[model samples]
Target: VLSEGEWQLVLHVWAKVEADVAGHGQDILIRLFKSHPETLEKFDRFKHLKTEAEMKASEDLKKHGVTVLTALGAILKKKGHHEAELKPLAQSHATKHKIPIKYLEFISEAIIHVLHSRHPGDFGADAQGAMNKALELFRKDIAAKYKELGYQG
Candidate 1:
């Protein structure tokens, strides 16, 4: 649950990198993999990319990164109606991919880290707090979906 002002602040900070969503998305993934190398094992497409340079050069990584950012953008834009938007993502990751919920938490951390690095001046404490709240909501909703889908992991 975010206040109206917090929502506005999150959107405002996100807008600064709207044009380069793909780049930022890739950066976020790279950051995540850097911080948590084991998390890369979750991505079949990227698991082989051992080096940061290799990850940056992979088209699959680029495409998936775009998908990641696009989904986040949709979540942010949908605001109060995000549950519907999150359903397909949750279902796919839960049933098809069988991804662990902790990876989502790691991704959330990477997102905030990348956003803060990209726009340190704009992404202050309030903006980070707003983004964290939104991401936490996302994680909770996805976890609930995982449970509903009978995912063991």
Candidate 2:
């Protein structure tokens, strides 16, 4: 479990992305390239890229980041089937990776910093509430999935 401070920081990241998921995600991808250039080989977005494409991707990442971040944040914040839309994907992928949602959010924020040299705008109360709601569901689902596999974390 993270401290209140840590949660707050992650929540802030979520909120920043919520307002603009694609842009945040694009920024993350760009930053990820800068931090770990080798990772570019792994991404289709950057695969077998010439210098021009890479440069273009770097420039366009901010816009893409806003789209990705906003989309993911919306899933986290808003209710209805949208949250559930990610559930199946999250369940399958997360269970295989054993990657907690908290850590995922942490990694995302780290990428965001690389893009923005710090972070994005403040996550509003709506983003905070949405993140909290998602976390609540995450706690229950992740734990249950782990226990069902007979592998305790």
Candidate 3:
């Protein structure tokens, strides 16, 4: 539900970052883990990584990072029609992974943190605000799906 101007601001920022999706995605996840180590338990492949060094060296982490970013890119492109891409992902995390909904907020913050650090000048307050609104929509969409699937958390 982004306004035209908000969409423009978000896509402009995304254009700068999307070219290096793997790097940005991995950095976002790494930042998330650094701030909330408990979230590491949610990832089977990454749970064994005891240090940032190990995480950086992890092939699984790299591949999964790309996967996450690819999905995010698709959702962004889908605009208002995001359910086709997001619902299945939500179902998987809700039922299969059983990931806490709160972690979505953590992931959002990590994404914004990485983006801001990488492009501090471009990601000013307005750009960050647009990104926050977009990510919050994503989180809410996933949470609604989770509720529909009977995942109470």
Candidate 4:
């Protein structure tokens, strides 16, 4: 749960950098794939890329990145308060798709990095903390669904 101030901080910083998510989101996923190649293996399509530029150039990658970023942008627009709103989506990924928690952690970190990269002057310590907190809440919502169903993946 975020304090009022934290929610405000998150919302403020998000507005400043949200426009960059489409491009930056793709970069973040590329970075994640490079940092953990195993993650690419999970994708039947992206796993075939022999070069970073090749994967970056993939239309599927761009589409998937934009899709995920758009969903997150909507969630952030609500200041991450609507955990219940995301519960069903989380359940699908957690139970059926079996997304690992570590991946979620890394994604959150990547989002923070993207936000910082887009607006370093505005995304200060408070903004970072608020985003971190909001992401933790987002992560926890997925976990809570898993817990409720006695599943993690």
lDDT of 4 by residue, 1-153 (tens): 798999888888877756766687688788778877777777786778878889778888888888788787788777656775688778777777677877888888878887888788878999899999999988887787777887764
> What is the Cα-based lDDT of residue 99 in candidate 2?
50
Which candidate wins on lDDT? Answer: 3
Model 1, residue pairs in steric clash? none
Compute the lDDT for candidate 4. Answer: 0.80
**CA displacement after TM-score superposition, residue 52 of candidate 2 (Å):** 8.8
Candidate with best TM-score? 3
How many pairs of residues collide in model 4? 2
lDDT (C-alpha) at residue 87 in model 4: 80
Task: Please rank every candidate by lDDT, starting with the best.
Answer: 3, 1, 4, 2
Question: Candidate 1: where are CA atoms >4 Å away?
Answer: none
Displacement of residue 70 (Cα, Å) in model 3 is 0.6
Output the better candidate (2/4) by TM-score: 4
Q: Write the per-residue lDDT of candidate 3 for residues 5-122, one digit (tens) a residue.
A: 8887788888888889889988988999999988998888789999999999997898888899888878877665798998789989999998888988999999999999998888
Error of 1 at 141 (Å): 1.2
The all-Cα superposition gives candidate 2 an RMSD in Å to the true structure of 6.9
Backbone clashes for every candidate come to 0, 20, 0, 2
| Model 2 TM-score on a 0 to 1 scale | 0.44
Compare candidates 3 and 4 on lDDT and give the better one.
3
- Predict model 2's lDDT versus the native: 0.51
lDDT of 2 at 26: 56
